[model samples]
Target: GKVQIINKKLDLSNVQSKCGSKDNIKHVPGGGSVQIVYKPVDLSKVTSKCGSLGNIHHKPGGGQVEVKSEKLDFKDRVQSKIGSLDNITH
Candidate 1:
């Protein structure tokens, strides 16, 4: 079967002040995925569980990742994007 792709724009305020990092969240059911790309508030402290890093030429401050999920109801919340996100999800 094919997978359902969803792109979501993360709230910067919640990331910096509230959550303290960039969050990649998946709110779908029956096998889906989540990806996030953003400028870390503190580059050295950037953290992610679902994706990998890549060339971050899309923004001034840099960070990128691509996540793949096999099971449904998948969710990730990456709370760090200081300058801006190169790609919200891929």
Candidate 2:
């Protein structure tokens, strides 16, 4: 499947206080080094794995990010950690 940039809010119940300052995405349950590969997905129609990426860690706001079907891609994982998914496109 082609890559899609999904935009939505994340489930931050697991990492609310210690998300960026002390803890990180890799520390959360079922959140260890995952890859995101997405195209230009409209913010109004984002769902599934795409939904999980939105603001799962960062603040509550709409942003462009990639979503990869592949698993454990180190490059994508690194990008997620840095919060630098400014322009995600296929």
Candidate 3:
């Protein structure tokens, strides 16, 4: 029942995004179901009757995932074309 998202993330946009890198995200190439995982957690929900709530450890990761695409990566492939297109008259 808690989300860590803040307002700065929404308003932080400018005229252009020259370069960037996103974090805490899972990337899926093809369109389909994927697992959305966060980092490690403390514990998992289990029956309290089976413990004193101490030394109770389990994987606290249960999230459904997906993916997307953004224009940012190692783009060493840069090309420029000039010089009159072989002097062709328009």
- Which of candidates 2 and 3 reaches a greater lDDT? 2
Q: How high is each candidate's TM-score?
A: 0.14, 0.12, 0.16
Model 3, 5-89: lDDT tens digits are: 3433234434433246466655668555454435343233322224232343344557945575645333334454443423222
**Candidate 2 structure quality by residue, lDDT tens digits, 1-90:** 775566665575442332343433444455345565553332232223532342445444588776668454333222223445454335
Ranking by TM-score: 3, 1, 2
Candidate 1 structure quality by residue, lDDT tens digits, 1-90: 765555565644422324455667565563435445443353333334454433243333458666667653555566743564353423
Instruction: Please list the residue runs of candidate 2 whose C-alpha ends up more than 4 Å from where it truly belongs after superposition.
Output: 1-28, 40-90
Ranking by lDDT: 1, 2, 3
Error of 1 at 76 (Å): 32
Q: Model 3, which residues run further than 4 Å from truth?
A: 1-22, 26-29, 40-90
- Give the whole-model CA lDDT for all candidates, comma-separated: 0.47, 0.44, 0.42
Summed backbone clashes in each candidate are 15, 14, 1
